[PDB]
Ligand binder design. Structure first.
Ligand SMILES: C[S@@+](CC[C@H](N)C(=O)[O-])C[C@H]1O[C@@H](n2cnc3c(N)ncnc32)[C@H](O)[C@@H]1O
Ligand SMILES: O=[N+]([O-])c1cc(O)c(O)c([N+](=O)[O-])c1
Ligand SMILES: [Cl-]
Ligand SMILES: [Mg+2]
Length: 214
């Protein structure tokens, strides 16, 4: 992950220590202009922000951390005592994520777990003291969105009103997830049309609110 280290080094050299906004701006400018990277980004980040502002989650699970952009972005909006648990399968990306979170001033809100989402999710109650989740941000490999959604449900981690928010439902796309949550009476869905981070290709997020196993 040479590019990812470069992004981190750019942030460490140019952003302001302890300042989450400064970190996000440094990443977004670097990535838009110099080296594209799969961060949720600023435009779609504003939709993520709005969802968190509307629903005010205190326990938030992120699937897929990468360099920590979205962890920093979401953590900046959370109340005291809130927990953002973020799961990242790649140890080198997790290491960057932790540096990024520490530098941004938000480490006290974030718990990073190195591992595959499908291994970690069944451990969240017993090993991470989770009860249920208020919100989940899905932004890992898209072929995991549907299986992890069903796993979350099976493991008893969703309550009525738990908000799923999925990135990239149009590009690269998550068609099997979308078909499921839209067609299922167990999820109330809203689609937010936007763009591929840093670019003009159309993309979107799906917000799917769990309605219980009905
Ligand atoms: C799109 S990047 C996440 C971007 C991040 N949410 C952001 O906006 O800054 C996707 C990440 O998912 C991770 N990933 C892929 N499969 C995963 C899995 N099964 N469990 C956890 N992380 C996984 C990849 O290593 C990669 O870092
Ligand atoms: O290829 N891409 O444009 C992306 C974009 C993204 O925002 C991703 O999250 C992604 N992925 O997780 O594979 C891929
Ligand atoms: Cl953007
Ligand atoms: Mg994405």
């Amino acid at each position: 992950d040479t590019k990812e280290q470069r992004i981190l080094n750019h942030v460490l050299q140019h952003a302001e220590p302890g300042n989450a906004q400064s970190v996000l701006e440094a990443i977004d400018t670097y990535c838009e202009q110099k080296e594209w990277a799969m961060n949720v980004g600023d435009k779609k980040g504003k939709i993520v922000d709005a969802v968190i502002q509307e629903h005010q989650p205190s326990v938030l699970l992120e699937l897929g951390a990468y360099c920590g952009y979205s962890a920093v972005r979401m953590a900046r909006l959370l109340s005291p005592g809130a927990r953002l648990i973020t799961i990242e399968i790649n140890p080198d990306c997790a290491a960057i994520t932790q540096r990024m979170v520490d530098f941004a001033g938000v480490k006290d809100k974030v718990t990073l777990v190195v591992g595959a989402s499908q291994d970690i999710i069944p451990q969240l109650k017993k090993k991470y003291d989770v009860d249920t989740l208020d919100m989940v941000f899905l932004d890992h490999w898209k072929d995991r969105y549907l299986p992890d959604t069903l796993l979350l449900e099976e493991c008893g981690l969703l309550r009525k009103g738990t908000v799923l928010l999925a990135d990239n439902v149009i590009c690269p796309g998550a068609p099997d997830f979308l078909a499921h949550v839209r067609g299922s009476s167990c999820f109330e869905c809203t689609h937010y049309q936007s763009f591929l981070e840093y670019r003009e290709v159309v993309d979107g997020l799906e917000k799917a609110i769990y309605k219980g196993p009905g």
